[PDB]
Design an enzyme around this catalytic site. Structure first.
Site, short mmCIF file in Angstrom:
data_model
loop_
_atom_site.label_atom_id
_atom_site.label_comp_id
_atom_site.label_asym_id
_atom_site.label_seq_id
_atom_site.Cartn_x
_atom_site.Cartn_y
_atom_site.Cartn_z
N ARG A 14 0.83 -1.23 0.00
CA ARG A 14 0.00 0.00 0.00
C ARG A 14 0.84 1.25 0.00
NH1 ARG A 14 -3.06 1.50 3.46
NH2 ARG A 14 -4.80 2.40 2.28
N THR A 168 -20.18 4.47 15.68
CA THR A 168 -21.27 5.14 16.39
C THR A 168 -22.43 4.16 16.38
OG1 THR A 168 -20.73 7.33 15.50
CG2 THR A 168 -22.98 7.07 16.28
N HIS A 189 -8.73 6.85 4.97
CA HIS A 189 -8.28 6.05 3.78
C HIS A 189 -6.79 5.70 3.79
CE1 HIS A 189 -9.15 3.91 0.23
NE2 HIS A 189 -9.97 4.76 -0.35
N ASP A 193 -8.75 0.59 3.45
CA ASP A 193 -9.52 0.62 2.18
C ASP A 193 -10.89 -0.08 2.48
OD1 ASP A 193 -6.39 -0.32 0.53
OD2 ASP A 193 -7.27 1.57 0.92
C1 LIG Z 1 -9.50 15.91 -3.96
C2 LIG Z 1 -9.25 14.52 -3.47
O1 LIG Z 1 -8.59 14.32 -2.48
O2 LIG Z 1 -9.82 13.38 -4.19
C3 LIG Z 1 -9.24 12.05 -4.21
C4 LIG Z 1 -10.23 11.04 -3.65
C5 LIG Z 1 -10.66 10.04 -4.74
C6 LIG Z 1 -11.92 10.75 -5.24
C7 LIG Z 1 -9.77 10.24 -5.90
C8 LIG Z 1 -9.23 8.88 -6.55
C9 LIG Z 1 -9.70 7.44 -6.19
O3 LIG Z 1 -8.66 6.54 -5.80
C10 LIG Z 1 -10.78 7.47 -5.07
C11 LIG Z 1 -11.43 6.18 -4.52
C12 LIG Z 1 -12.74 6.08 -5.45
C13 LIG Z 1 -10.91 4.83 -4.98
C14 LIG Z 1 -11.66 3.64 -4.34
C15 LIG Z 1 -12.63 3.83 -3.14
O4 LIG Z 1 -11.78 3.81 -2.03
C16 LIG Z 1 -13.06 5.21 -2.73
C17 LIG Z 1 -14.11 5.42 -1.63
C18 LIG Z 1 -12.25 6.35 -3.26
C19 LIG Z 1 -12.76 7.63 -2.73
C20 LIG Z 1 -12.18 8.85 -3.25
C21 LIG Z 1 -11.09 8.70 -4.27
C22 LIG Z 1 -10.00 8.65 -3.14
C23 LIG Z 1 -8.99 11.52 -5.60
C24 LIG Z 1 -8.21 12.09 -6.51
C25 LIG Z 1 -8.00 11.55 -7.92
C26 LIG Z 1 -6.70 10.72 -7.92
C27 LIG Z 1 -5.36 11.47 -7.92
C28 LIG Z 1 -4.20 11.18 -7.27
C29 LIG Z 1 -3.03 12.12 -7.48
C30 LIG Z 1 -3.97 10.02 -6.35
C31 LIG Z 1 -7.53 13.36 -6.21
O5 LIG Z 1 -6.47 13.79 -5.62
O6 LIG Z 1 -8.20 14.26 -6.67
C1 LIG Z 2 -8.92 15.10 14.67
C2 LIG Z 2 -10.22 15.22 15.40
O1 LIG Z 2 -11.00 16.20 15.40
O2 LIG Z 2 -10.62 14.08 16.20
C3 LIG Z 2 -11.43 14.43 17.35
C4 LIG Z 2 -12.92 14.16 17.14
C5 LIG Z 2 -13.32 13.00 17.97
C6 LIG Z 2 -12.87 11.90 16.95
C7 LIG Z 2 -12.29 12.80 18.94
C8 LIG Z 2 -12.71 12.45 20.36
C9 LIG Z 2 -14.14 12.00 20.64
O3 LIG Z 2 -14.81 12.79 21.62
C10 LIG Z 2 -15.10 12.00 19.47
C11 LIG Z 2 -16.58 11.61 19.60
C12 LIG Z 2 -16.39 10.13 19.27
C13 LIG Z 2 -17.12 11.27 20.95
C14 LIG Z 2 -18.61 10.88 20.96
C15 LIG Z 2 -19.50 11.08 19.70
O4 LIG Z 2 -19.94 12.45 19.88
C16 LIG Z 2 -18.91 11.43 18.39
C17 LIG Z 2 -19.89 11.89 17.30
C18 LIG Z 2 -17.49 11.92 18.44
C19 LIG Z 2 -16.95 12.31 17.08
C20 LIG Z 2 -15.53 12.68 16.95
C21 LIG Z 2 -14.74 12.68 18.22
C22 LIG Z 2 -15.22 14.08 18.75
C23 LIG Z 2 -11.07 13.56 18.51
C24 LIG Z 2 -9.85 13.48 19.01
C25 LIG Z 2 -9.45 12.55 20.14
C26 LIG Z 2 -9.21 13.27 21.43
C27 LIG Z 2 -10.23 14.34 21.84
C28 LIG Z 2 -9.73 15.52 22.16
C29 LIG Z 2 -10.56 16.69 22.62
C30 LIG Z 2 -8.22 15.66 22.03
C31 LIG Z 2 -8.79 14.30 18.41
O5 LIG Z 2 -8.76 15.59 18.11
O6 LIG Z 2 -7.86 13.59 18.06
#
Ligand SMILES: CC(=O)O[C@H]1C[C@@]2(C)[C@H](C[C@@H](O)[C@H]3[C@@]4(C)CC[C@@H](O)[C@@H](C)[C@@H]4CC[C@@]32C)/C1=C(\CCC=C(C)C)C(=O)O
Ligand SMILES: CC(=O)O[C@H]1C[C@@]2(C)[C@H](C[C@@H](O)[C@H]3[C@@]4(C)CC[C@@H](O)[C@@H](C)[C@@H]4CC[C@@]32C)/C1=C(\CCC=C(C)C)C(=O)O
Ligand SMILES: CC(=O)O[C@H]1C[C@@]2(C)[C@H](C[C@@H](O)[C@H]3[C@@]4(C)CC[C@@H](O)[C@H](C)[C@@H]4CC[C@@]32C)/C1=C(\CCC=C(C)C)C(=O)O
Ligand SMILES: [Ca+2]
Lengths: 214, 213, 217
Positions: A14, A168, A189, A193
């Site tokens: 990967r 959740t 991602h 995957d």
């Molecule tokens: C803006 C953004 O971050 O979109 C990303 C996100 C992208 C839509 C895309 C290429 C492709 O694999 C994608 C897949 C379908 C591939 C398989 C499934 O897992 C998905 C659920 C997935 C979600 C989004 C995704 C990841 C993107 C591209 C096009 C590819 C380009 C490069 C340089 C790797 C991108 O950079 O634009």
């Molecule tokens: C990047 C990010 O925003 O993740 C945040 C967001 C976070 C995933 C998380 C801690 C935790 O409550 C989370 C809950 C599950 C808690 C209960 C449910 O309400 C959710 C709908 C919820 C969504 C996201 C969430 C709020 C994060 C953490 C972990 C530590 C928390 C703090 C304050 C440092 C983080 O910042 O790493």
């Protein structure tokens, strides 16, 4: 201190995906399923177990069964924690606020339930966001008992290195002879995957069906 | 790749576009339980492969409506003359995937042949993008492990991200019908509920009506 | 006449959610969507008998709930967290001939009649205006969009800039038959700084109640 081991990126099939999902294509994704809990619920009742620690533990067992659920960036390197612990919500009825507590994971559900129920007993009424503090090798579970959702989706403003999985749970309901619980899972991602989430959700359905409590 | 450059000053979605490129920028995901009852029966009775058959209907839809073909090319908003399905291939042995594009054609049978060639020639290649990536793709991803009620893509950086992303789930029986989870992610700057709803109504149609030619 | 609405400043120091609100305005900042298959059987029958348009009527129900609970009515106003006195529905209007849309607000009133007469004027006066915001935008709105094409099991909005984006977004989908029930996709996006799962769930359970208990009056 917490054990981890290192992913070798230059040798990983990967490598490319990780590199892109860490920069120009970074993305996280959510999916929801109506999970069949008929058997699991019967089981939790038969045994007089609390639903919530029982469910948190089957998820924890899965996070601790595939390495893609335990990834972190640690001092610049991709790492896999030797274990992850569940960090679950607790609701306070009086202030209408919540906390997240985490409990130490073990394979034996009996041993985990004892640690869980102890954690809830000493820290349940502590109104801090994180009564126990937080540790670096956890994954998230929250209970949303009010809503039998068809979708639950998280949009975290900053996803950089956010590799911990977030589950959740929704309000279970009846559908003919079944009890269906809504279940959403958000992952990054760069580390999972569709195959990883899919195999996990299948093994979760199966485990819910075949575990015999204890 | 040929294209048409949009005349923004004359476009009825001028203010929308401008809000959706800056202060109100956003993306939105939708899932539906598509009814593939008739589509699947058609596919089996004609011994087609399901996936290229579906990709091709997605791909006709994207090639019938310009809102699905917009892109920002050198500071200008442009509509591609055509867009090419970029779809996932799973590698069972390494448990990783690749994203491969196939040249769109109107006729199904021309398409199935370019697709079959693509997948035969590059299907074992473990590159993330075995054919690289071109400017005018939309994305199609297959997920046959999960019969989801929701699939939602949260991209970190949605700037100029105009390429539609469909994600297909695990189909299932319900009552007498065969339903298949189907999700679509679009960017608000180039499509509105209407464009996505029209598209999805047409998908459903083209599936119930397809003849297998 | 204009209505300038009143507000109250939140004393964050006496707020049980202060730690949370401060995490969710910075390191944990996030937003979340959830969708329900709303049971509209009794509501649709009520609507059909009293010959109302469905939309203004549903919008009014949503409006009543946003105006029953202050977590839906928060905003950052000049660098301070405030609760608006009340909030007004900003809802979509579809323009058939250009295949474009507008977002239109109508001033809220408690009484459906008052509200249905305001909405009808607004829709007749601005229904044809192609402006994104025919009436501009005021500071204390919540959003509603109609999406009558699609019976979704999911709809969710991913806002690129969520700073201080505390206004609730509702999305209604195409209703349909499930046995004896009439169901309608309903989705809600909220910001975590001002709403938790509890707020949103309480709201959706109340919305169901209100839909079943409404009398067209
Ligand atoms: C803006 C953004 O971050 O979109 C990303 C996100 C992208 C839509 C895309 C290429 C492709 O694999 C994608 C897949 C379908 C591939 C398989 C499934 O897992 C998905 C659920 C997935 C979600 C989004 C995704 C990841 C993107 C591209 C096009 C590819 C380009 C490069 C340089 C790797 C991108 O950079 O634009
Ligand atoms: C990047 C990010 O925003 O993740 C945040 C967001 C976070 C995933 C998380 C801690 C935790 O409550 C989370 C809950 C599950 C808690 C209960 C449910 O309400 C959710 C709908 C919820 C969504 C996201 C969430 C709020 C994060 C953490 C972990 C530590 C928390 C703090 C304050 C440092 C983080 O910042 O790493
Ligand atoms: C934070 C953010 O990006 O919200 C944006 C996103 C916004 C909530 C909003 C105004 C409004 O049409 C919106 C609709 C309901 C309108 C109709 C439906 O299509 C959507 C389901 C939709 C989603 C989000 C949205 C696009 C925003 C505004 C409102 C302010 C005014 C202008 C001119 C931009 C904003 O920036 O404040
Ligand atoms: Ca293990």
């Amino acid at each position: 201190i917490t054990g981890y081991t290192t992913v070798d990126i230059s040798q990983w099939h990967r490598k490319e995906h990780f590199e892109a999902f860490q920069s120009v294509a970074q993305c996280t994704y959510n999916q929801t399923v109506q999970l069949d809990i008929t058997a699991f619920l019967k089981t939790v009742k038969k045994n007089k177990h609390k639903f919530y620690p029982a469910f948190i533990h089957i998820l924890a067992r899965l996070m601790n069964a595939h390495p893609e659920f335990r990834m972190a960036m640690k001092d610049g390197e991709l790492v896999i924690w030797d274990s992850v612990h569940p960090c679950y919500t607790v609701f306070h009825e009086q202030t209408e606020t919540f906390s997240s507590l985490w409990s130490e994971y073990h394979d034996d559900f009996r041993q985990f339930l004892h640690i869980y129920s102890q954690d809830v007993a000493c820290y349940g009424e502590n109104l801090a966001y994180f009564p126990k503090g937080f540790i670096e090798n956890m994954f998230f579970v929250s209970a949303n008992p009010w809503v039998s959702f068809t979708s639950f989706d998280l949009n975290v403003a900053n996803m950089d290195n956010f590799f911990a999985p977030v589950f959740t749970m929704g309000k279970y309901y009846t559908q003919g002879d079944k009890v269906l619980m809504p279940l959403a899972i958000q992952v990054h991602h760069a580390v999972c995957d569709g195959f990883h989430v899919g195999r996990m959700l299948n093994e979760l359905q199966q485990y819910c069906d075949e575990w015999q409590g204890g």
